[PDB]
Design a protein around this ligand. Sequence first.
Ligand SMILES: CCCCCCCCCCCCCCCCCC(=O)OC[C@H](COP(=O)([O-])OCC[N+](C)(C)C)OC(=O)CCCCCCCCCCCCCCCCC
Ligand SMILES: CCCCCCCCCCCCCCCCCC(=O)OC[C@H](COP(=O)([O-])OCC[N+](C)(C)C)OC(=O)CCCCCCCCCCCCCCCCC
Ligand SMILES: CCCCCCCCCCCCCCCCCC(=O)OC[C@H](COP(=O)(O)OCCN)OC(=O)CCCCCCCCCCCCCCCCC
Lengths: 177, 606, 459, 87, 128, 99, 155
Amino acid sequence: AFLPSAAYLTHQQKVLQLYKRALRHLESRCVHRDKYRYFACLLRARFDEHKNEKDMVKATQLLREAEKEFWHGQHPQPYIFPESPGGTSYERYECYKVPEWCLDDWHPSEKAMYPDYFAKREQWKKLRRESWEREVKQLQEETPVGGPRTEALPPARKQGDLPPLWWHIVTRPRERP
Amino acid sequence: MNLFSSLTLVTLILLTMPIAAINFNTHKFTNYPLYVKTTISCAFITSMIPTMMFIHTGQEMIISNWHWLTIQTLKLSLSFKMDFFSMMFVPVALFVTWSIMEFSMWYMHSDPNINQFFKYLLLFLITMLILVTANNLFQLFIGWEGVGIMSFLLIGWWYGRTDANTAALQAILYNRIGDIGFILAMAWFLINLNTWDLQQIFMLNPNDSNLPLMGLILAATGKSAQFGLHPWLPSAMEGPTPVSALLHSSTMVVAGIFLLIRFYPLTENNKFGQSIMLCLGAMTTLFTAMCALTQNDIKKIIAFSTSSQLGLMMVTIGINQPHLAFLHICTHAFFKAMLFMCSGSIIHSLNDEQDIRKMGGLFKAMPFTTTALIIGSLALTGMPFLTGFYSKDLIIESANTSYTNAWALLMTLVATSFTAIYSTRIIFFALLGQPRFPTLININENNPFLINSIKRLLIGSLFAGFIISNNIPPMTIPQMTMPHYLKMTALTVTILGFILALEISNTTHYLKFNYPSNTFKFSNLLGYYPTIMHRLTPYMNLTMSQKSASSLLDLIWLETILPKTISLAQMKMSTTITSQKGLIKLYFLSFLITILISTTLLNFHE
Amino acid sequence: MLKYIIPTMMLMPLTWLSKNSMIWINTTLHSLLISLTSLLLLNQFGDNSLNFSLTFFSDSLSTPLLILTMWLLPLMLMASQHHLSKENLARKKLFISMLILLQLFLIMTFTATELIFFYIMFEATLVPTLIIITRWGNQTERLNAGLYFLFYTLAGSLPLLVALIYIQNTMGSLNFLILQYWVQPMPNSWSNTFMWLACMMAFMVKMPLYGLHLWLPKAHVEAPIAGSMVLAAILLKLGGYGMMRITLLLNPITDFMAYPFIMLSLWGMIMTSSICLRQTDLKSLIAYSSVSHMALVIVAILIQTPWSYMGATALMIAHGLTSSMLFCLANSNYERVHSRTMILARGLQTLLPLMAAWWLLASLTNLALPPSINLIGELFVVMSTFSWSNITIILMGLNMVITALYSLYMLITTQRGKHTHHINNILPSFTRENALMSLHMLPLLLLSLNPKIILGPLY
Amino acid sequence: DAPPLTLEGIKDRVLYVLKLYDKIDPEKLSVNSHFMKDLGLDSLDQVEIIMAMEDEFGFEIPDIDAEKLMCPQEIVDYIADKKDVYE
Amino acid sequence: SFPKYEPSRLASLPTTLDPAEYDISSETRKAQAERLAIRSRLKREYQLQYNDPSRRGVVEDPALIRWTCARSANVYPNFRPNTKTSLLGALFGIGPLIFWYYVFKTDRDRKEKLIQEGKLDRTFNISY
Amino acid sequence: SGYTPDEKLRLQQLRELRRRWLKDQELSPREPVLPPRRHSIFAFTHVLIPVWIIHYYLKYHVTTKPYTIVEKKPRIFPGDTILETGEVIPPMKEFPDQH
Amino acid sequence: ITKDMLPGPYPKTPEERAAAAKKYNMRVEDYEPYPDDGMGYGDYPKLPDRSQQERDPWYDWDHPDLRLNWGEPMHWDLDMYIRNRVDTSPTPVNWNLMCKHLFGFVAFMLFMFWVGETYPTYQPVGPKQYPYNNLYLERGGDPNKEPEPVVHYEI
Ligand SMILES: CCCCCCCCCCCCCCCCCC(=O)OC[C@H](COP(=O)([O-])OCC[N+](C)(C)C)OC(=O)CCCCCCCCCCCCCCCCC
Ligand SMILES: CCCCCCCCCCCCCCCCCC(=O)OC[C@H](COP(=O)([O-])OCC[N+](C)(C)C)OC(=O)CCCCCCCCCCCCCCCCC
Ligand SMILES: CCCCCCCCCCCCCCCCCC(=O)OC[C@H](COP(=O)(O)OCCN)OC(=O)CCCCCCCCCCCCCCCCC
């Protein structure tokens, strides 16, 4: 479907995703632990019965009828984790995730309350502006002609330099700011 | 007289002081929530004195202190009304919000904007006390819009969350349809009776009062979340737990019932409005209880529960028992707020988990909240001689022995059984059994704030129904002669619901699997009402907004008719005029033709 | 009225003889002094108007509009001095001069006792605004906006000149004090039908009416901030003042000649609010909201009842203040992010909290939160239209629901949600922007304490 | 509320959960033992392991990151990155 | 069997019930590779403009400008008056105006006729 | 399968930088460097003073104007005694007892 | 920006269609403009009309709240298909079945309310009796007239 590094989903990936969704929905229908354990073992036996099938069209039809079976017997509202999308506390703390570039607009009167922190911030910014040209030069010669094929980034090959495009995924805000 | 009005107005001024205290502050306030809590406790005492005066003598007054405006004949003044309803509701609301703010001191302790949260809570309380003490319809509308706006600001407290914004906007939309109803009623009263003050409305007493009553019924449907405009109340669970526990449980959502209570001289002479209210209330209570039967979120269960209780309030309004309806408001506030507080305690102890499928084994792990939850569910279901017994059984007894719609009574009884069913469903899935929560256990309830607030609301839910029902004066004739089966209807129905849901839970415990039915999907998915309406009506409205108004009319056709056609006509005429070939022979031929036309065809030489 | 005209024309040598850095300080200071001086017009009587001279008078309708104009001028001086920072000094003085000249024409317009002098000033107001829009506007289509605005106004207003001269020749005078006592019934004929159309279409265009509103989302959008403020706050109310003054001569033919425009303006506000629901531009959304509110004022004037007139003048003043504040807030966002798209810069409450509070207050007054004077005007118009007919309550309730919807959609889109990742030039709010917001907000909130001074001449 | 986490506690808890699995001999697994090769497990065993660790720590690991969690050290590093520990 | 999921305008078909999802033919693989290449190239452009330490402003998105220009400033150049446009304009432009005109005219005629006979109760009406 | 070696190397280096950045977010013991900046007064400042002001306002400015504080007349039962007139309201009739 | 990146009129030849597909950053085979009926769309692509809720929530979007990518072609009704507005996600029940079930429930409840209004419940009692001519003077009747005497006897 929508993948950063791959253009498609393999057959085994589809089977594993179906297995996880079916087990989660069966846990939702079977709220007690022992009952869920019993029916999870039954579902695991059903999945292991057709594990060794070499016919591609037959495995595809088995997957399609399994997806139809899951859609007929899904929970009207399954159990979603609190931080998972669709959860009760999903994206709750996004109002407190202030980006780090707002510290450059602070008044010097309130910058004096944290001298050592702002010194460390200054040396971090010095490191970033020193490494930017090296990392973009590394990225320029590693992309094949015609643009990149996937969205994966390369690491730093030699010693001393940081991986390319590292700033906004290292300085991201914490989960609980 | 000089103590009554002084103490009422100083209660209101005492409540409004901390808003000015926080607005004129420079440094960080030293424990501002404690200051607000102390202020509310003092205001509760100060408002508790005039209710003792009213209980002793019956002293009701009206204070029209500040003259505001005079629009020809109509005169608007800052008028407050101390009557039975205001004195019986203000201390209950102040008590409940005192407990809620102590619970908020425990609950929102780690929030970096706790001062803004307490300011918003105090603003909501100020607007609600403006609502319940209002005399004319303008001040009532001010309180109406104030509690609506505070609900919008408090539901979307975590404004970085999209679902909070959707819930807040949806609540605003339904309350604005209620505002349509309120505006229609106020307009009818001004046009036909030439007043907005309630005294002249009650004095003139119109007979053909169908239209303002339907306006008020629509407004109460919007505000109290009756059928048709219900789903904003269960959608409003996106906010913090104290916001729910105050507004969407005990104080804000009873404003429509209160508005219909205040106009009881108008509705007492109209059988049509009474039948409409009875049918709407029965529909609301049964539909919301049926939806509550198969929910898994605990806060959604309690939201559907309080919507069902509001439907019961609309029923007992519709059977011409408005004082019983007010008694049920004052009863229901205590145990509904404390049920929400205990649910919030369970949520906080299990790392923000609101699912009852990930609970259990909390009977001995959290004993105080377990005790309070059991007491609250028993008081909600109608256990004898608790707080709910003194209002709910009288409602059922009056509904049985009255000239009533048969179907409305039937769905009222079935909804009572369903309330019993979901109460014991909550108790079973949240306390009994084996633990289902994650492995690491940080269960704690040893905070003085949470314990003290739950304790105060527990004492209230134990004795307040008895005290209030023994202190109020008799404003009607209580029906106390009935057959044996009609006297035991409420208790037998609740017992039957308890037995049915105990058997349902026992069958759930078995090692069998069954595919879901259409009834289960109808009850679990809220009767397909939000999934159809919230996908269909916004689609039609927004497509009509863009494809018809924004593009077809003013970007295409209103631009076509007046300016563009005129511009093209002038362009074409200009290109025809200036396309001469610059030959003198053609110009002089045109001169000859002009002379001939003027001489012969136009007769300019006559 | 010469005690306000003469300091206004003396503002011109003040801005043309100041230093290179002291033009804003001097002009703002002395305009604020004249704005304080403008409170002496509140000497109104319950029976007679305040008649100064043969040419000038000021009753209780023109007084709030005058005070609004003279208070609005220093706000535009404070607002327009950031985007004119790098401009040439002579062009800066020319901009301030056009603002001064527009204020002079506006204060001579509301006090004109003669109707032809009112017409002359009311069409003299066209030139400074057209020059401001087409010169200091930022976009390509400011020229097209100026052409549309100019030609809509002139095509609407030339028959008004012809009809006013006809009234002068037939009745003998255009003095408004004379015409109150010398008025005659206007019978039903085709001649009087076209008299009504000629006398009404200029102010129907300027207000604007639905269907004649096509110039507004252009002139309100391609103008600079000061131009947008003076277009939304004052210039739309010239049409309202004109219909309030001119309806006296058009009776009893108004009672059936007002039907098509009542249907145009009752249905028009639903269409414009629905347009507001699906707008990708913030400035265009504010302009269409202005169209809806002026449609409300059109209906109130056309049904001609006392409650409708009081609601109309209160709603005019309230919408002027609210629209000016909303345009100022949108301009501050535009200065921060250099784009007018509503979906681009999101989640600004985490970065600009007090500006978010100002946004919330402006949105709350936009949807008529009681007891603001917005709600007072809207409520009085609703009562009078209910007295007119009962299904008007259905139309008004639908309009109120959509108005709350788009105001909160504005607020939730711009201020709430997750912030834009790649935008990192969100500077903290200046003291100038906050002072501008508070000077828009505090009079609006204070007027709820004494709302009797904005309720027209028949309070 | 919300007690903090460390790499030692994360590793101890993840090894506890993996030790309670009946299909893994507890005297053989370590912090960097592979699943398909060093322990002889199927892909379904990996899926059930990932679901068990999700239930243990109370947060959901997406599938596009779950397919690549192949030894206990990568599970520890993924949880440490997602919960921002050692700050 | 099981009841087949019928899609609607407001309830799309799920991606796990689509028969075209399970296609393994090389044309669809080539199409998916081309789409991934376009997406990765655009993401590389955005992240190059995004992580620049010397940039302080707005990374301009031509897609958003394209969307706003299409929504606003293209409708009249790409408008041709035909049967469909004129029919929809007459339905949505003069339809509701005529309908509301006749409704309000009928109501006001009935009220004004009832008033002049003294059949309408106007006892306390002195506000208008 | 698992990560590629390049994915593993990039993840390792990014995790090291992330942990260093998160460590650098801690506070020094001297931070923040703050600049150098009647038991029952609540029952007096918040109750007694507003009660004085409100009683003054109601006594000398609200009760002066007519029909500002309209109070319901007291409920009168048989057997009572009026303060102002001194009269005694007669008791009601004899009861025809049934119980 | 330039005038060759902005939208244009409806493409007729495959050459301008390919140029437009390259302009909007999409494949030529997947690029479908709106039909040329004169509504005013131009060559803007017709994207599959799905809400942003149907997007993958675990993908690293450039705009995470909108689930939108930088440079990607933006839908014509994107401000309508945001997560704050109209949803098009699949439902556990078929749409027609939910419509018929809800409508049948509402209609049945209304019919039974009407039936219960037709045949109400009551108690085996007579009318309530009030003294003093059914409280004639207390109900607001004027005292200068005299009403018809309402007399209640014992039983
Ligand atoms: C912070 C410290 C301040 C100073 C502290 C020390 C002094 C404190 C004061 C001590 C007592 C002073 C004398 C008593 C007070 C004044 C008495 C007096 O004559 O007052 C003149 C009058 C009394 O009314 P009036 O009847 O005499 O005149 C009304 C005015 N006209 C006729 C023009 C309409 O005004 C006031 O009292 C004003 C204050 C009112 C207080 C409440 C304000 C509420 C605002 C709400 C706005 C929106 C309302 C919307 C709803 C309206 C209804 C539908
Ligand atoms: C913004 C666009 C829309 C603008 C709309 C403007 C108004 C529309 C109607 C205007 C009519 C013209 C002015 C009439 C003034 C009437 C004064 C008077 O005394 O009337 C009674 C007089 C009566 O004549 P009299 O007064 O000399 O005679 C004495 C009276 N009787 C008849 C009893 C003996 O009316 C007229 O003389 C004729 C009036 C009708 C004129 C029709 C031609 C104009 C048609 C409309 C043109 C509108 C603008 C078009 C261009 C738009 C832009 C491109
Ligand atoms: C006693 C009488 C009883 C009468 C009852 C019958 C009459 C009333 C019938 C119901 C009318 C209102 C309900 C329908 C519209 C509801 C819109 C709404 O708020 O939808 C909620 C939705 C977000 O919620 P949801 O989708 O559930 O979120 C789940 C997680 N994403 O939010 C959105 O999708 C955002 C949508 C924003 C734009 C909304 C546009 C539609 C507005 C319609 C207004 C209609 C007013 C009619 C007034 C008539 C006056 C005479």
